[PDB]
């Protein structure tokens, strides 16, 4: 029986399959006296929910409500610890189900100023999660919170407004690039962006010809390959257009002399050509690259100088700079693709190392955010995530061992899953010497670490 129940701890069970009669048979057939049988006589509902899974059904609310109703029947069928009791377990799980209904209600309402509404509704969701926070041990609530956080963060990263982009120092190219990135990363509901683009292109007709090449020589320039699409659907006057015809247009001049006079150094990440030429180390020595050098230094210093509201705040701060996960990954690829040995100035090498740090850090941060949840499963998958990252991004390069500290430091800073020894003491204040060992064993199996003794 002990081996079976330990394997049950290691494994997971289906909410629909388990019934009240099944729980009654499991309790009755289980031996009466034991150092774990007392707990299952005391907290069978919480213990069963500790390992249950609902993620398979793909509909958390209804399956979890069915599980709650079966547990309610078993609790009708049914003083050691006021903090954790089967009736208290049912009450807390019903509260969590209310939270899981209201998160979907919020998503439906907000998705159809929008920013204050988003902030207040996400604050309500955070309060709801805090109400559901203490029983993080359970696998059922673990996957429920995991899916909830996945959905909310995926919705929030896309529902970004466009107010923060406009600056007085922004040029015509900078503005069109900002709204271009907005189109390529956010088009779900913001449909007026194309109309504004069509209105604005007629304003900057004279200014649009200043930052372009001749026809014949522009295509061979480095970095035009990646920016051909943005250029084509800049020139055509409609962001919905597709460059399937392979036409040749006035290619944008990516030279630093043109960029500095026609762009702003702070909004560079929206422009792919400068990234490509900087990684490729094909920059002319005479080029004056102090602009992005200082911008890179100050941005990294501000980011390294650093709650769910705070997480979201950093989220729209970082992506406001144009850092999109797909874009960051695709424009970190050539960092590995580009050769290590080439001729470039020391400042260029230093800013390249800085940008390698930045691309790795933001790529890891974004992908962890895509799988973020204040639960043990996040760290459990993050172990394999960091192993894979060591395998691929760092590789066998010796110089890449220095840049490792910032990635792990930032990801553990922003996505820390907090657990308190006082929390476990309260969870086991009434638990006797007999019952604490298997709660400890289940926690060790789930988290994977020897957190306390």
């Amino acid at each position: 029986a002990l081996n079976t129940v330990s394997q049950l701890e290691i494994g997971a069970v289906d909410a629909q399959d388990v019934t009240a009669s099944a729980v009654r048979a499991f309790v009755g057939a289980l031996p009466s006296s034991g150092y774990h049988f007392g707990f299952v006589r005391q907290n069978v509902v919480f213990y069963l929910l500790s390992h249950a899974t609902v993620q398979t059904a793909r509909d958390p609310l209804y399956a979890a409500e069915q599980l709650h109703e079966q547990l309610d029947r078993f609790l009708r069928h049914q003083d050691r610890l006021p903090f954790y009791h089967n009736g208290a377990t049912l009450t807390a799980f019903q509260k969590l189900l209310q939270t899981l209904r209201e998160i979907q209600t919020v998503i439906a309402e907000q998705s159809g100023g929008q920013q204050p509404l988003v902030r207040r509704v996400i604050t309500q969701l955070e309060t709801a999660a805090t109400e559901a926070r203490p029983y993080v041990n359970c696998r059922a609530v673990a996957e429920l919170l995991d899916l909830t956080y996945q959905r909310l963060i995926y919705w929030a990263c896309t529902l970004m407004p466009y107010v923060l982009f406009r600056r007085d120092t922004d040029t015509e190219l900078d503005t069109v690039l900002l709204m271009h990135f907005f189109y390529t990363h956010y088009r779900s509901v913001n449909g007026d962006l194309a109309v504004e683009f069509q209105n604005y292109v007629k304003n900057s007709v004279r200014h649009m010809s200043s930052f372009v090449s001749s026809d014949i020589d522009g295509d061979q320039k480095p970095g035009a390959e990646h920016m051909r699409d943005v250029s084509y659907k800049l020139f055509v006057g409609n962001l919905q257009a597709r460059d399937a015809s392979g036409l040749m247009f006035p290619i944008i001049s990516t030279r630093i002399s043109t960029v500095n006079l026609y762009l702003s150094p702070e909004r560079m990440f929206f422009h792919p050509g400068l990234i490509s030429r900087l990684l490729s180390e094909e920059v002319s020595p005479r080029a004056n690259l102090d602009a992005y050098a200082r911008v890179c230094d100050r941005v990294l210093e501000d980011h390294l100088h650093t709650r769910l509201l705070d997480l979201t705040q950093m989220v729209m701060r970082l992506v406001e700079l144009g850092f999109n996960h797909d874009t960051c990954a695709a424009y970190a690829q050539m960092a590995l693709i580009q050769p290590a040995s080439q001729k470039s100035s020391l400042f260029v090498s230093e800013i390249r190392e800085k940008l390698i740090q930045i691309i790795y850090n933001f790529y890891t941060f974004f992908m962890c955010l895509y799988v973020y949840s204040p639960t043990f499963l996040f760290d459990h998958r993050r172990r394999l995530i960091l192993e894979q990252h060591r395998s691929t991004l760092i590789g066998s390069k010796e110089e890449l061992q220095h840049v490792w500290s910032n990635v792990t430091l930032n990801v553990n800073t922003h996505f820390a899953v907090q657990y308190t020894e006082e929390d476990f003491e309260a969870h086991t204040k009434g638990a006797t010497e007999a019952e604490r060992e298997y709660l400890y064993r289940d926690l060790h199996s789930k988290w994977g670490v020897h957190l306390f003794t």
């Binding site: 990954a329 290590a340 894979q388 060591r390 395998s391 691929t392 066998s396 199996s445």
Partner: protein
């Protein structure tokens, strides 16, 4: 304990399938060796076998014997070792590239799997230069439809076009030959006509 390690095995299988480990062959070898030692320790705590059907990643089964797990481990070792050997041979045979470290590792950020493409590239790769004459079809450890010879070397690893443009122009054979030429929607030099006339007259 056994279930958690089996899930770790399946996660490693998916990572190798999705190329989450890149060109770090040593890391994959160390991980699979550690997994094999862990499964051997599980067997000792609970005899290893070299027979049994492979575990199904799509449908995990608790009836799989430890021999199946050991077989899957050795299959992964063979896959990674044959891959590394093929990289070593191609590096020796091609002088264009300098070192394996300079060769990057691509990310699955650009993922697109059409079954039609997945079958057509393999069927066109069949009659290319491969070490063994005959051929066969199996289901790989990853669970997909992998095609290998009797040696078990992957066709996508034992047969190659030798050029990116060759593969691109070979798999582009769909309907009409050229599409962008049609999309663009678009007579001799007079000197050549003059030289043709003069050469004909002289001859």
């Amino acid at each position: 304990l056994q279930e958690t390690l089996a899930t770790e095995y399946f996660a490693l299988l998916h990572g190798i399938q999705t190329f989450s480990y890149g060109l770090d062959f040593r890391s994959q070898l160390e991980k699979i060796r550690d997994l094999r030692t862990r499964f051997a320790e599980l067997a000792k705590r609970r005899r290893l076998s070299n027979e049994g059907v492979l575990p199904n990643p799509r449908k995990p089964q608790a009836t799989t014997s430890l021999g199946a797990f050991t077989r899957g481990l050795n299959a992964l070792e063979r896959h990674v070792q044959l891959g590394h050997q093929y990289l070593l041979n191609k590096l020796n045979g091609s002088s264009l590239v300098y070192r394996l470290e300079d060769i990057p590792s691509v990310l699955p950020a650009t993922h697109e799997t059409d079954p039609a493409l997945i079958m057509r590239d393999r069927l066109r790769r069949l009659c290319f230069a491969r070490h063994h004459d005959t051929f066969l079809e199996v289901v790989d450890v990853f669970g997909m439809r992998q095609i290998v010879t009797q040696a078990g070397e992957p066709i996508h690893l034992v047969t190659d076009y030798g050029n990116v443009a060759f593969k691109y122009l070979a798999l582009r054979d769909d309907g009409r030959p050229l599409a962008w030429r049609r999309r663009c929607s678009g007579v001799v030099t007079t000197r050549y006509k003059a030289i043709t006339v003069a050469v004909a007259v002289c001859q």
